[PDB]
Amino acid sequence: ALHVPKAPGFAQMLKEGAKHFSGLEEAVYRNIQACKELAQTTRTAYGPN
Amino acid sequence: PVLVLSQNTKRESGRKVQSGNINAAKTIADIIRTCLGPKSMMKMLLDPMGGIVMTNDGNAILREIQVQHPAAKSMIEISRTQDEEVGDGTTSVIILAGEMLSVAEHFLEQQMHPTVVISAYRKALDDMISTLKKISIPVDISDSDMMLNIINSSITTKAISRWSSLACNIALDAVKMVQFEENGRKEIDIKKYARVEKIPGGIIEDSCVLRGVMINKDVTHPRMRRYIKNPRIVLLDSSLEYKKGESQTDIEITREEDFTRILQMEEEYIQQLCEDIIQLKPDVVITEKGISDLAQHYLMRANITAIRRVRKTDNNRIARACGARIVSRPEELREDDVGTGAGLLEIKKIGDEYFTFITDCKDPKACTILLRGASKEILSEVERNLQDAMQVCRNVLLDPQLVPGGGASEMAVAHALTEKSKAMTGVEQWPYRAVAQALEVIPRTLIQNCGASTIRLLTSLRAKHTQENCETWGVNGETGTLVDMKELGIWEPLAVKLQTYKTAVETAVLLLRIDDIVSGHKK
Amino acid sequence: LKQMQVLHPAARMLVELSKAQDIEAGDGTTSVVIIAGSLLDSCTKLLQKGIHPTIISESFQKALEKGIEILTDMSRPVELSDRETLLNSATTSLNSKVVSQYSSLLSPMSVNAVMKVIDPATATSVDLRDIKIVKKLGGTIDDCELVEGLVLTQKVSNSGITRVEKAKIGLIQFCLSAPKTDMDNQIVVSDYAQMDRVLREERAYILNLVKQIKKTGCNVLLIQKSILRDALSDLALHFLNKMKIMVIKDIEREDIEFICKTIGTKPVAHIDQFTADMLGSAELAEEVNLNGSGKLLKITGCASPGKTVTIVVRGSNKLVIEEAERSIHDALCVIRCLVKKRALIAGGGAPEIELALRLTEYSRTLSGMESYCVRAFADAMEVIP
Amino acid sequence: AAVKTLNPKAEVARAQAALAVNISAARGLQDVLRTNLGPKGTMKMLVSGAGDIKLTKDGNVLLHEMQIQHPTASLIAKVATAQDDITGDGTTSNVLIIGELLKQAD
Amino acid sequence: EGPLSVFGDRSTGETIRSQNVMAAASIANIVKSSLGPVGLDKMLVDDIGDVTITNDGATILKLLEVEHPAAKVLCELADLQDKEVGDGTTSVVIIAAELLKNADELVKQKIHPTSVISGYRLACKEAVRYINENLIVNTDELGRDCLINAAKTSMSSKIIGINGDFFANMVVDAVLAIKYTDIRGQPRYPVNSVNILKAHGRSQMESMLISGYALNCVVGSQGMPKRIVNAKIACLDFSLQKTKMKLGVQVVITDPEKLDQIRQRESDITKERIQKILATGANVILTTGGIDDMCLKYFVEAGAMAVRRVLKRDLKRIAKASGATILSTLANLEGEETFEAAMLGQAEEVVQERICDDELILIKNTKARTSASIILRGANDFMCDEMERSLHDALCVVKRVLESKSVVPGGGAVEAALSIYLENYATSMGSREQLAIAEFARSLLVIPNTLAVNAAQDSTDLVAKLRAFHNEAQVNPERKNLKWIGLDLSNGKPRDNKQAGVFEPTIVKVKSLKFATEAAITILRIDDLIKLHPE
Amino acid sequence: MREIVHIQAGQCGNQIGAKFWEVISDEHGIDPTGSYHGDSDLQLERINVYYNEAAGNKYVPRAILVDLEPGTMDSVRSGPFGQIFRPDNFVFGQSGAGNNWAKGHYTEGAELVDSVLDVVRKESESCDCLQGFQLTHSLGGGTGSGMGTLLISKIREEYPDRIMNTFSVVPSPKVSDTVVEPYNATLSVHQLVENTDETYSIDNEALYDICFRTLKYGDLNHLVSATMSGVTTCNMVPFPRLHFFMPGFGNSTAIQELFKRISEQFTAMFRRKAFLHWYTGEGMDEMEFTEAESNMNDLVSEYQQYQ
Ligand SMILES: Nc1ncnc2c1ncn2[C@@H]1O[C@H](COP(=O)(O)OP(=O)(O)O)[C@@H](O)[C@H]1O
Ligand SMILES: Nc1ncnc2c1ncn2[C@@H]1O[C@H](COP(=O)(O)OP(=O)(O)O)[C@@H](O)[C@H]1O
Ligand SMILES: Nc1ncnc2c1ncn2[C@@H]1O[C@H](COP(=O)(O)OP(=O)(O)O)[C@@H](O)[C@H]1O
Numbered sequence A: 001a002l003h004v005p006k007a008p009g010f011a012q013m014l015k016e017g018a019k020h021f022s023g024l025e026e027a028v029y030r031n032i033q034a035c036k037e038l039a040q041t042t043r044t045a046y047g048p049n
Numbered sequence B: 001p002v003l004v005l006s007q008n009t010k011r012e013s014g015r016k017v018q019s020g021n022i023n024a025a026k027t028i029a030d031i032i033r034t035c036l037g038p039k040s041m042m043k044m045l046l047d048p049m050g051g052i053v054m055t056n057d058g059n060a061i062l063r064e065i066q067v068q069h070p071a072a073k074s075m076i077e078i079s080r081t082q083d084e085e086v087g088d089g090t091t092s093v094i095i096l097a098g099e100m101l102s103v104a105e106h107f108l109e110q111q112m113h114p115t116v117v118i119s120a121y122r123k124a125l126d127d128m129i130s131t132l133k134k135i136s137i138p139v140d141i142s143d144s145d146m147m148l149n150i151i152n153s154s155i156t157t158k159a160i161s162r163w164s165s166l167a168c169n170i171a172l173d174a175v176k177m178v179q180f181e182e183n184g185r186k187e188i189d190i191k192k193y194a195r196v197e198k199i200p201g202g203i204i205e206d207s208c209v210l211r212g213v214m215i216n217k218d219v220t221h222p223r224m225r226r227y228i229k230n231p232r233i234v235l236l237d238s239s240l241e242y243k244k245g246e247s248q249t250d251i252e253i254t255r256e257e258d259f260t261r262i263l264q265m266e267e268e269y270i271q272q273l274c275e276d277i278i279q280l281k282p283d284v285v286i287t288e289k290g291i292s293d294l295a296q297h298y299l300m301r302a303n304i305t306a307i308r309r310v311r312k313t314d315n316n317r318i319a320r321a322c323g324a325r326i327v328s329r330p331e332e333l334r335e336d337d338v339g340t341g342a343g344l345l346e347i348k349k350i351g352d353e354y355f356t357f358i359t360d361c362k363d364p365k366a367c368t369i370l371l372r373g374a375s376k377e378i379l380s381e382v383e384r385n386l387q388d389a390m391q392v393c394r395n396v397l398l399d400p401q402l403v404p405g406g407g408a409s410e411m412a413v414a415h416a417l418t419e420k421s422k423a424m425t426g427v428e429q430w431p432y433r434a435v436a437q438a439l440e441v442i443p444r445t446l447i448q449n450c451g452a453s454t455i456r457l458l459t460s461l462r463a464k465h466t467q468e469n470c471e472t473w474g475v476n477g478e479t480g481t482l483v484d485m486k487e488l489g490i491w492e493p494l495a496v497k498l499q500t501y502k503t504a505v506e507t508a509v510l511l512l513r514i515d516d517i518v519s520g521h522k523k
Numbered sequence C: 001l002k003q004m005q006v007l008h009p010a011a012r013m014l015v016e017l018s019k020a021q022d023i024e025a026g027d028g029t030t031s032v033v034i035i036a037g038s039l040l041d042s043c044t045k046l047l048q049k050g051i052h053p054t055i056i057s058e059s060f061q062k063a064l065e066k067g068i069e070i071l072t073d074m075s076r077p078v079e080l081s082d083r084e085t086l087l088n089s090a091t092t093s094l095n096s097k098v099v100s101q102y103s104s105l106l107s108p109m110s111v112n113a114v115m116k117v118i119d120p121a122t123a124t125s126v127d128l129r130d131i132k133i134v135k136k137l138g139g140t141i142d143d144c145e146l147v148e149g150l151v152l153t154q155k156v157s158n159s160g161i162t163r164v165e166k167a168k169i170g171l172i173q174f175c176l177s178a179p180k181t182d183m184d185n186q187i188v189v190s191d192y193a194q195m196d197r198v199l200r201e202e203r204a205y206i207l208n209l210v211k212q213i214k215k216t217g218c219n220v221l222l223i224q225k226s227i228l229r230d231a232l233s234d235l236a237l238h239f240l241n242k243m244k245i246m247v248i249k250d251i252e253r254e255d256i257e258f259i260c261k262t263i264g265t266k267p268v269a270h271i272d273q274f275t276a277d278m279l280g281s282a283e284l285a286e287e288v289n290l291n292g293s294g295k296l297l298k299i300t301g302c303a304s305p306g307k308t309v310t311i312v313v314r315g316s317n318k319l320v321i322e323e324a325e326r327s328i329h330d331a332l333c334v335i336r337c338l339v340k341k342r343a344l345i346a347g348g349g350a351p352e353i354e355l356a357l358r359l360t361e362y363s364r365t366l367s368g369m370e371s372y373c374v375r376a377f378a379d380a381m382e383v384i385p
Numbered sequence D: 001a002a003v004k005t006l007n008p009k010a011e012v013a014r015a016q017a018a019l020a021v022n023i024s025a026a027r028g029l030q031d032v033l034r035t036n037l038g039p040k041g042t043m044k045m046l047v048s049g050a051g052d053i054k055l056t057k058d059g060n061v062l063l064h065e066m067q068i069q070h071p072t073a074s075l076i077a078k079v080a081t082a083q084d085d086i087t088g089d090g091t092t093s094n095v096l097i098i099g100e101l102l103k104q105a106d
Numbered sequence E: 001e002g003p004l005s006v007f008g009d010r011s012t013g014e015t016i017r018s019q020n021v022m023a024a025a026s027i028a029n030i031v032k033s034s035l036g037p038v039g040l041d042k043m044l045v046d047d048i049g050d051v052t053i054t055n056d057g058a059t060i061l062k063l064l065e066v067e068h069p070a071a072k073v074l075c076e077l078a079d080l081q082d083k084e085v086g087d088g089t090t091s092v093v094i095i096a097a098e099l100l101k102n103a104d105e106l107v108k109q110k111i112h113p114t115s116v117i118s119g120y121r122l123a124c125k126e127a128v129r130y131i132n133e134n135l136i137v138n139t140d141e142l143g144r145d146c147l148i149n150a151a152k153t154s155m156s157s158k159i160i161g162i163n164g165d166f167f168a169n170m171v172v173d174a175v176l177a178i179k180y181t182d183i184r185g186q187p188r189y190p191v192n193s194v195n196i197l198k199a200h201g202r203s204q205m206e207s208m209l210i211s212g213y214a215l216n217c218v219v220g221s222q223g224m225p226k227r228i229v230n231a232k233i234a235c236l237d238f239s240l241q242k243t244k245m246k247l248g249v250q251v252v253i254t255d256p257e258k259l260d261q262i263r264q265r266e267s268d269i270t271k272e273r274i275q276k277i278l279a280t281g282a283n284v285i286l287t288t289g290g291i292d293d294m295c296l297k298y299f300v301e302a303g304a305m306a307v308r309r310v311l312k313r314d315l316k317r318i319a320k321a322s323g324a325t326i327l328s329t330l331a332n333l334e335g336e337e338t339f340e341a342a343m344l345g346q347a348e349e350v351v352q353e354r355i356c357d358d359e360l361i362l363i364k365n366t367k368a369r370t371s372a373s374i375i376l377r378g379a380n381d382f383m384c385d386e387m388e389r390s391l392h393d394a395l396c397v398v399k400r401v402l403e404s405k406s407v408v409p410g411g412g413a414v415e416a417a418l419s420i421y422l423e424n425y426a427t428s429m430g431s432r433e434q435l436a437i438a439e440f441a442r443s444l445l446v447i448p449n450t451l452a453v454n455a456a457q458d459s460t461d462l463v464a465k466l467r468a469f470h471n472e473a474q475v476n477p478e479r480k481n482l483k484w485i486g487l488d489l490s491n492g493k494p495r496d497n498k499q500a501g502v503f504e505p506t507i508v509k510v511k512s513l514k515f516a517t518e519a520a521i522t523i524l525r526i527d528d529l530i531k532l533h534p535e
Numbered sequence F: 001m002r003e004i005v006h007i008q009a010g011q012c013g014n015q016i017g018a019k020f021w022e023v024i025s026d027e028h029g030i031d032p033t034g035s036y037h038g039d040s041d042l043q044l045e046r047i048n049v050y051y052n053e054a055a056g057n058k059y060v061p062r063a064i065l066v067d068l069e070p071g072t073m074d075s076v077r078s079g080p081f082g083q084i085f086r087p088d089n090f091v092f093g094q095s096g097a098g099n100n101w102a103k104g105h106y107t108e109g110a111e112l113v114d115s116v117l118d119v120v121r122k123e124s125e126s127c128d129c130l131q132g133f134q135l136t137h138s139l140g141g142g143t144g145s146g147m148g149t150l151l152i153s154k155i156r157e158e159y160p161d162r163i164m165n166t167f168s169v170v171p172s173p174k175v176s177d178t179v180v181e182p183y184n185a186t187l188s189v190h191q192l193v194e195n196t197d198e199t200y201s202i203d204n205e206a207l208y209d210i211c212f213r214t215l216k217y218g219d220l221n222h223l224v225s226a227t228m229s230g231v232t233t234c235n236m237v238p239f240p241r242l243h244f245f246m247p248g249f250g251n252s253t254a255i256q257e258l259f260k261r262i263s264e265q266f267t268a269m270f271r272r273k274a275f276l277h278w279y280t281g282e283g284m285d286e287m288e289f290t291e292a293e294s295n296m297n298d299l300v301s302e303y304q305q306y307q
């Protein structure tokens, strides 16, 4: 008992290098975090200063 | 290559480091966020030893998971700290620390200095302590029903909730028996003198706390009795064998009779030891070291039952339980060192193993909790829950102050802090009020894990706690409704909630002070 | 040169040359290498001109003899009583080193040290092993000190006894522990009484030893280092401490002659010969702490301070401490040169320039093919200025 | 996920995944052990890595000898081991009732 | 390359000088962010996941793995400052690096390094003199709030900063408790004799000052008592075990009748020693060595508290504090074995106290001297270790303040005053040494500059205001009280730090300056580098 | 001449043992079947103390082989000289037992000792006069730690008057080899000091260095066997507690180094209580670790008594 197997269904049928995110945590919050990182990359260029 | 520091030394600094620490902390929090409250769900952890850990305990989970981020390491360490100190709140503390760091991230992005945030956090911590001590209530620890309700209010959130009455009675009996005073120093050591023995099989409903102790042992010789109705017990740290001397005691034989004389001298030494023991007229003899077969012969001739190789901890528990004193030289044996107080020694077969019971003691200052159940995993979880229960009982017997649960205390303190913040005119009022609103995460989490409407319920609750005598109002973790804790019965130990708040706030302070990570350098 | 692992044979030979100069004079180890390199760089063009290496060598020997004449003529005699001249020599030697802002401190020390380890009226040389240098991290180079007494890095074994006034000191080359013959020895016990008897007689032996030590008036005890046997048993330390005797063990078998030369003690190897005439009287013996940067045992004041001194070198870094030690050694060696040869010469490239000039004249007078080589020698010596 | 941001080489089965995994393993054990039950059951042969032969119809023996590395299977094997240590019989029926409870709950 | 046959690389001239300055700058930029009340702590991971939180510059530079020798020099500088002072380990590194920077700028402008070194030495001497003559305040004139203010100043920038109001009280009480006067009647404050224990658990404010001593040990047997009131204490430096004859002693029996008595004597020897010890009244027995179970049983039956494997230094301190005599042997000048009650120590209580999940021993109210221990309580071992380091810094600072009764103001006050005075004083000393002294002065400003930068304030404006105040102080004899003005980093405005309570021991600044100057001189003296290829 | 039974536990033990039982077999002429394909009579002179001749002149060795995981004993059967052993002296469980000392020394593989003990009796009965036992195991690692000390223990209870000569693979200093090795080794030394009569500390680090010197995983089991025969092919232990040895070509006090290392890594981990929940939740009290530590400071001080 040292390995968690992929759950039956979509997790097993998924292709090799493909990724699947679902729910607020795996999808929504990670998207919001990415967009926030982007805004941070471009924030310091806003305005005359 | 002309470097100044060794390759592999990577140094990060600044708001990236701060946000990384805060994200690692709140990730550790999100790991166990759902393990809080009465309607939590189990998690199946896979040990590196092929084992399994099925639990709801925040510290169990964080102890079984492995991380590499130093902020996550620090959070796991504070969970361990909370568990070792009070033995409960191991996930409430994690969640509170995560929420405090989360709300501090805001002020950090807005150019506020971490030292300013930290000073505000410390002010807020002091005021939290004040408010908890103000809203606390006392307890008559002589009220067994009150103590049983406290223990139910502490184990209801765990798997043993199905056997709540049983587990509460077990924990209360165990702690009240382990309560011990000597030379004016009260001591509840429920780690050395309250023992949990898990025997898989049977049914949990027959689990019990013994008025005595239990060890996994059999008689050394099957002619020895296995049932004694008022045993006088002797405990020894020394081997009843003939062992060598500490010096180079080499012998030199030239005469014929000398070899046999030496072997007979060994036998006579064993005889003399056994006579020094028999002189006290005991019924049972228990050793941490071996017992030679000739010694067994002499003891049996004296009608004594012997147990050969017991652990030092088990021997100390037998001492505390039966009223004996461990000896190391049977010549130095005294009636005061003999163990009277045990009411029955029994050696019965549980499954295919022989277990020695020294139960029916009178005034036993040590105990063995015999847990029975479906499997080693179920019994490990039951044992952890019972550890929680006993630690809560101990915390109560030490500090008899209670505070209301169900998030009622969190909301009361948040309201008190918001009210106190109106006199603050500097720039720290904002982080102060922020930790105040960051305390709401406990009732928020309770509502989330019961499956009710967080927005609506938390609004109704924040509104209830704005009235005058409503600091006891909280939430049900089983229905998703607001209730009065005076009517529900979920009351936590003030010591537990104080340690929770203190550890959370100090962890936040530490991780806020942290900047400029460095790594790679080898000890 | 010794530290940079040069590989070419000629470079190795220049290293050996610098070491020889360090031996004979202790100062000039850079000038000598530069002079050698320059003479060879001149041999370059001589060889190209087509002169034989043997002719070059002989003409260089001639120029060398003439240059010795010139330098001797330039020189002026010096009396070791001329403390200002000695101070000026030491300052000159130190001007080149990292310790030159502290020259005001390390020149008078470098002169006192040498003038304390020689009879200035008869001395024709000095053994700088009589001058002990003790590098201790911490402080700054302005904390360097000249201790007239004795300094030891060995720690004191007694707790509570760190300072002793009117100190009588004894060196102990025997071991204060259970007796052990040089032959294989055992103690065979066959009765229970003999065990207690053995312990008791061991106690009594050790106690008799420490009592014979105390009876002389000794209050400071330096015990030589002893492998193959315990030089200071726990019983012996207990008894000495109870008798209020400071004890310093682990003295090294090479520091013994120095310690004796310093504090007039005579090393005792048998307890029978440990008497009062074998001690050394010191006005103070103290274990001094250096601002948490270590400890030092200073035996200061002596009724028989025989031609020995110690210099404690302080510093903020190991590197600067090592270079302070080397520079102070250079100053001591300059004073040693003055002791050996009572003659003084100006600096600032004046001798090299005079050499260039007078050997140019000598070359003009020595018409031949040696003239080219002597002129090369002169222009080579013109490189130091 | 959350655990995988801290320990990247971490395996996780959440909410529905966890339940599917556990119920699937339980039903697999039940599918193997269904044939042991009763006198009309079939004997299984079990060959060690050395080649030693075991003929058994016993649920606990079959469990411990099967070649399985599943956490739910380990849990149920432990429950069966306790059943066997205390009562000596009931391991096959134990596994069957566990599997069928899990199925009827799914 | 080809002529010189050394088997290695060679840097020479401006190349190696710039390289050395780069190394020193690297080391200083590591620690610059951890300077002053607005500095922040650092994580350090030791290649295995071992984490260390710290603000201590000496600790940081010890934990780092530095490869360049010119940076190892600054690491040793911080270590030496920590050894000799106990505070200033970051400021000294920053100042040494800045001195190196400016001195290399001068050497690039082709001022000779000897001249730069002379100017630095002159400026160091004159800065020390000016401090000692104009910038010191007497702790006698200030009282005990001076000590409290110095402790709070040291604790600012640490994780016990805001809690300084209470930690300073603890530190001062502890140092005054371990105060002792010896022969020569000089007052000595031997810190490192205050014991500091760490135990995660209760909040920081719950840390405890023990009037007495705290021992990270426990009783040897669970049957022994765990509290004793009128504790008579016996400190032993020998082991209490079954006696074995020494190496050069053998038992050779030729009459079997002696074996029994010999074997029993092997234990009766220790039994007799223990009985002799207990006969005097000793109920507490501390031992550096071990204690067999046979012996622990004797202690249990006597009702005594025995402790084994105690540490030699803990034992020495307990002995000094309680009035006991550490015995390595029970042996007198009469060739016997005895134990006198005068060799015992005393204490109003000895208890085994339950600290969250561990247990320790507390020796309370020892007579013949007062001692002090501190149990630090935080959220985890990282916090507790940083608290220990901060408290050690504060204890060393208070010790220095009590030894030398002079303090100086903080917040860059001393550095601003020195910058002003030395930029005015350089005009008198040579022409190139003048430039060197001016650069020393300007370098000194790196402390308030860094303080303001960390406070996230306009360093330029703030340091200009500071220098204006101090110039007014040095040119107007009616406003000499402006010397005490320095930075207030919570508001970004100068402030009278002598009235605000921001004090530092004079020795801190003096030794910092001297050590930084020596480090700068040694590194500046280097104009070549030969790095030999390893073998 | 009295007979010596040889138990070998754990992977390390089961893989030193086979190599020893091969070296000696070739030192005696016994082939894999067991037939004495030898000529000299000195091979048969002292062959009764190691081999238990059966009918048919097949010399079966007096060796037991134990491990909680069968896959090592399978590799021993399949290996070389893996057929002289008695097909019933192979005692194995089904649980791997990881590398937890508590797992191997407690109910999680405790019944097995009762299967290795009815093979020790069935192997001593054949012996006319049983000299004693030789257990080969690993101080800390897999089962050899736990199961190797519950064996020394139960065999010192069942035969408490016989020589117990252990060969233990002390952990190498550089290589941690496991996260719980400090615990397993202090817990095992705490049993071997009491229940053993002579212990030979075979350091993997030093053995690996010796193999590298010879060159100028199997190589270590081939460089430990020649030492095991130079110890068991033909005035020690003056004090009955300093019975730890370092072989070579030694009752050296260099053991004190290894012990200092082990006890300082034990104390480092015990301070933070790291990897302790497993032991407490599987059958140890938090005080057995304090006892183990105390007893290792004991050992280190007994060994420090000389120098
Ligand atoms: N029946 C209940 N209804 C509502 N809240 C509860 C109930 N039982 C316990 N709680 C609250 O849940 C909180 C946490 O419970 P528990 O899970 O035992 O602690 P932790 O979250 O630290 O593990 C406690 O503060 C308690 O007030
Ligand atoms: N203050 C000074 N003014 C001029 N020349 C000096 C001064 N100090 C030393 N010198 C010259 O420097 C030379 C010594 O330099 P140094 O680095 O010691 O080389 P060496 O090691 O070869 O003696 C001497 O020739 C001396 O004339
Ligand atoms: N409250 C304060 N206000 C302004 N400056 C302070 C304050 N406390 C300390 N400082 C300054 O911080 C500097 C040292 O900070 P820190 O890095 O904590 O000490 P160290 O130099 O020992 O590392 C000192 O030069 C002092 O002037």
Ligand SMILES: [Mg+2]
Pocket (backbone or CB within 6 Å): B088, B089, B154, B157, B388
């Ligand atoms: Mg709880």
Ligand SMILES: [Mg+2]
Pocket (backbone or CB within 6 Å): C027, C028, C092, C093, C094, C096, C330
């Ligand atoms: Mg010179």
Ligand SMILES: [Mg+2]
Pocket (backbone or CB within 6 Å): D089, D090
């Ligand atoms: Mg059946």
Ligand SMILES: [Mg+2]
Pocket (backbone or CB within 6 Å): E087, E088, E089, E154, E393
């Ligand atoms: Mg500081």
